[model samples]
Target chain A: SIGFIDRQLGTNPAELPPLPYGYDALEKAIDAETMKLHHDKHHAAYVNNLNNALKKHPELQNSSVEALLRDLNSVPEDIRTTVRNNGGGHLNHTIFWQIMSPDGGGQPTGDIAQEINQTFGSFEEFKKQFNQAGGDRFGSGWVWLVRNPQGQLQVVSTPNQDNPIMEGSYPIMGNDVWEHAYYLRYQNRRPEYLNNWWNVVNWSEINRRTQAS
Target chain B: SIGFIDRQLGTNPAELPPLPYGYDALEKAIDAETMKLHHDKHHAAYVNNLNNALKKHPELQNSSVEALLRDLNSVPEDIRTTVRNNGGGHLNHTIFWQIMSPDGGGQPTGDIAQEINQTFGSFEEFKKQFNQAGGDRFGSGWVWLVRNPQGQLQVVSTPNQDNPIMEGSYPIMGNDVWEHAYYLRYQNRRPEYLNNWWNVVNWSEINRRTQAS
Candidate 1:
């Protein structure tokens, strides 16, 4: 529901979704200051920038952020890169905010849980491989557990605000690897952050995304 | 001489150069913790990884990192990316450290000063344009004051640890826009970081690089 709506008929500016829980909610893994800055500053900038780009092409203003990203070349050439980066950030973060919870994490218990095990052997191996992929991503990006074009689960990474949707895949869940996401607390130990990140994963919501698509 | 040596005739590994100033030296513009973490952890990792990549091809151990990046295709494909990203990072940060000092910043007052004014009107305007270029860079990267192949000065930005030399230019000086560079103190205020960065720029060293090439 976050992005499936055909906003192609609507004109409201893209908005920053409120964090589902308090800033301190995920403190066990991500610190509150990082959460607050990531949501209020980083994510807000993306939404604002996306709206600014949409103004350049009134026709694009009405399309859902998802639609613009899914067919990025169709966007006005002058504003295409703007839409791709900011719009991608807006949509990616919208889903990102919902896929973690203070009360979340342990092990997957939803329909996707079985698929996670089948696809990557065991959940432990899945976490290991997922963290490895996230660690291997050279710079700013997201690591995803995506439902690919073949309807199979896979782990992938995309650089600089790009998301799985842009390449015709559905991101079941993703973890931001941008240094801004963890620099305050984790500093340069990205692997530690990636592994500890599971302490807050919202499997129920993650499964909801999987089922919705 | 940081990277100009013909290491191609030697077998020494790439080494992480010490920060030109103490971690607290640039505290007015950058925090000590950020400087410490950025140097000890991030830059160190790049050096270590670059060496690891070189291990796959012992013959490559002798080549200067600059040579490997200058003609990247000549590298073994198996470790090309590792070298490109990590090697570029190794060389870039090596210069990044020398070009900043606690005693630095004021106005460009060396051989590059007249050129700065000639190219961008005045030092202030040059900084404004340079900072804007840095801001426009979408993700982890550096903005440079480079002497291009034409031997004219230009401001340019590159993504993800890439340096001006990768494109056959001589970097007079550059500022890192990677989130880790300023995230501890600046957070989402990258422009502020970029602008304040001038306060620590070592113009003497900058002019030295210009004259060196």
Candidate 2:
């Protein structure tokens, strides 16, 4: 049991946070089966593996996934990549769940919207650059609107379970471009999926992340 | 049609090779839906993009995907990466289909078998090493049994769509490790997919390739 393992480790082992809503809750944007499988299976694997990788490092027994990722250089080389991917997966997916709501969609309000327009020239331009960032990612990865140290948002992409966290930035919001994220519904049309993904954006949550830092 | 496009390109436009058997033919090893999507979508994307890239370089217009792959450095800079990925995809999948059959599987016969035993101790050892090569590859690549210039065989792996051809070696046989190859049926159980893939090896074709050089 994850809870049992968590007890032995004297800390929570990046357990899979519950999907904030039911599968198919964001239909037309994302299919039901993909959400179920992505959360129940894919995210579960990351949590389990993150737990398994932590067992060998007593020094890191109580380290949060965020802590492990933030100091990747300190992890043992053998399991460093394992922790990076699984830990990144746990961190990213945990954010992914909270950032989408059934009623979520349309555009951000207030400061986040003003910031998006300021950094990107316009909201339309921001969406274009954001979608392009995701569309141009060569393989399984993610597109992020990350907060730079100056607190200005930048559109960027990272390859394969990596996030802006690896580079010491925090994502205010991100879109998963991994095929498993959209393949059940979109198949090879990742561009379409990326374009449509904005319709499911939980701007309120995104705005919250924007100022949380 | 691949035949028509092949004729138009004079050499070939990285056209989709016909499935050597029905979609369901490899059902015991790969499901029909996966096989169909793999060929029709994944492989077709490669072909289309490969064709699109060839438009920029008339000199490469008549070159086969094999020729382009073997001399990647010589390709024009603007589309070199594009050609490498999609050209390699076309070439690899071309082999992927032919080297598999409904009636495939079991050990090698004749000279190939003898060579495997000589180089890797036994057919069993060769399979073990081959599987390990694929299993350990971090992501989206292939495991190769390649023939070096001296006629010695080496087990190798390459990231993304790269193959032995990238380094002037020829793959005597190879296995694709992209998640797209096995995700539908086996999900994240890539080792299980790799293990079962052996059951669909068309040794006759591989044996035919083994002695050609």
Candidate 3:
């Protein structure tokens, strides 16, 4: 069977990546209905729209979503914004699904654990900074923890579906602040969602991403 | 009794403007739950945050929300973005509620009806254009029908809680496309919300705005 990354290579139309776990997997934090709608409806639209935009320029179809987003200026002006928004949506959602699990939550583990402590004083402080950044993100966007070029940990927020990769940074972790991400369960209580989100964060997968970064 | 505009002038802390009609008033088009949250929670947060920012520079506390937004560069750089997001939110939602009602909908009437018919060829065409513009708004934003400086009716959209007044145009009509605005009722179907939104459009108020423009 083809792996998720292979399907994202863009030689073929980008397909919605299935959740790594069941819809109820993260019900400890996110609701099952939210998970179902977010993955099935929202992410599907992004993938479909991204593929539709690529159709206008067949030459670009072979590039991965990352490649398309990283060098957006190189894309044809007509479909540039469409690709940026939808392609970013596709990449962001894929990573979102990959980095969550039913058996998730608790303090960071592995190499990232040390990194968080070093950067933000401790795991508790790191969480405070991250949650504060996420809560401060106005409108629909994301808050990210990224490894900078100098190998320092940084917390940043990007508007809409923008990923850190667009700015040449490697995001080790991100939390979506979009209303659709938490509105069903958390409603306007975004801070609560951000706090509870730590409960479902798959530290093992995050460690994997951190090591890769 | 204070006029809505008077309360918005900012001599006092910005207050959440009461919805002109009951929360259930727009039930045919928008749900009461959505309205309650949209007004009581979301809009209130914006007002609270806007006032919080103003506390930093009390000299600016007397300006209207619209004035602050329209001349954003003049606001202290420290609180410029906060004002832009929250102040714009205050102004946008105030207009959103003022321009919608239970006794709303049907084709545009009076002077604006003639203008829309002439500009868009017909009210039907105007709606198609409006809804298309709304649907095309990529992220959290607003779609607008504004009277441009040339006295021409124009269809435009602004990202986040931005209004046409910020860009020197006078908006006669605007609609919120933030996911929180319709997610509970329409989910991912923004087009459906856009179409159903016309059912609650207070044409009389819209005509009043057009006359003021």
Candidate 4:
């Protein structure tokens, strides 16, 4: 479907996806201003830069964003860093926006729930380590809950616009820990931001990604 | 004198240097709010972390912050990263605060001026390249006008808490490009912040460093 969606574009360069919900939609967990800027200003810049990178490499336009990322080393050196940074930025934030919702949180249900328990002893322990991963990241990056090719769940962090795709893993969910993500509200206190992040997590969407993958 | 000053401190650990002027001194160019946070919170954290790194290696305590950073690889691996990051952070900020004054901007005077003209073609050319260096750096870090051990004046940038010392050059002056240095005041428009920073540059201090080096 991702491939189909890429082919659907025909000649158009990648575009900034619209914010799925209203800016104030996640008020209880994230401020409306941050959502607005993060989506419009920051994520929009990534989309624009990704498109710019594709300009010099029209031959590479047929690949999906994920495919491009997985084979980023094959990309031309001139625009490789640009695509890696902006393309990863676009993909990561796209997944990021979808995996949280107003009527979400309170842990996943169905098969994913049992798998989470089996993988990390309990949901609580998994949450603890996920939050720890978010905190332990030294600088601008993402903390992810990824499933390796064997379908085993893992907690990991990557630096500066990196993602699981670059390492041949499947990302189910991730949290952006860039200072811009939380600085206006939480400043340097990342743990508190991590603590508050769970309230609006779209577990159903997360489960959907897991099951589909 | 830098070495003598270090020898004078003896076995005591590194300390956070005072701001040299009131936090409000650079208010015309840099906002008082950014100055307060940049020094009081951000720079202070680097100083504390550097001290903490030194605690585990008291024998390493005698060297200056600049010395430690210049020879970062010589440090114990357990604390190498911590020292390289924090020690560089401390030294860079210390130099940063001293090189910008309430009265600054325009161009360098005396020997430093002739050297700038000779080495960089002119002050305007030097400024152009330095700003480009700052902009070229993809993320948090600094741009510097440093003199190599051969005494050649050159412009360069480093990523994330790195300084010219790390490359075996003596820093004459530098600019902080870390978002925290300008984000609260300039948001995503780093160039405007870089432009305004010139208005507060303490060229006298820069000249002093150049002559002393």
DockQ, all candidates in order:
0.85, 0.37, 0.74, 0.41
Which candidate tops lDDT?
A: 3
Off by over 4 Å in 1: A1-11, B1-11
Estimate how well candidate 4 is docked, as a DockQ score. 0.41
Local accuracy of candidate 2 as per-residue lDDT tens digits, B88-108: 777777778878889998888
For model 1, what is the error of residue B6's alpha carbon versus the real structure, in angstroms, after optimal superposition? 11
Native-contact fraction for each model?
A: 0.79, 0.06, 0.53, 0.00
Q: For model 1, what is the C-alpha lDDT against the true structure? A: 0.84
* A70-110 per-residue lDDT for model 3 (tens digits): 79999999999998899888888888887788898988888
Best by DockQ: 1
Candidate 1: fraction of native contacts reproduced: 0.79
- By summed lDDT, the worst window of 10 consecutive residues in model 2 chain A runs over A1-10
Where does candidate 4 stray beyond 4 Å? Answer: A1-11, B1-11
lDDT of 4 by residue, B42-81 (tens): 8888878888878898888876666676677789999998
Report the C-alpha lDDT of model 3 over B56-140, residue by residue, as the tens digit.
Answer: 9999987877778778989999999999988888878878899999999888889999988888999999999999999998889
Off by over 4 Å in 3: A1-8, B1-8
Query: Could you tell me which 10 consecutive residues in candidate 1 chain A have the lowest summed lDDT?
Result: A2-11
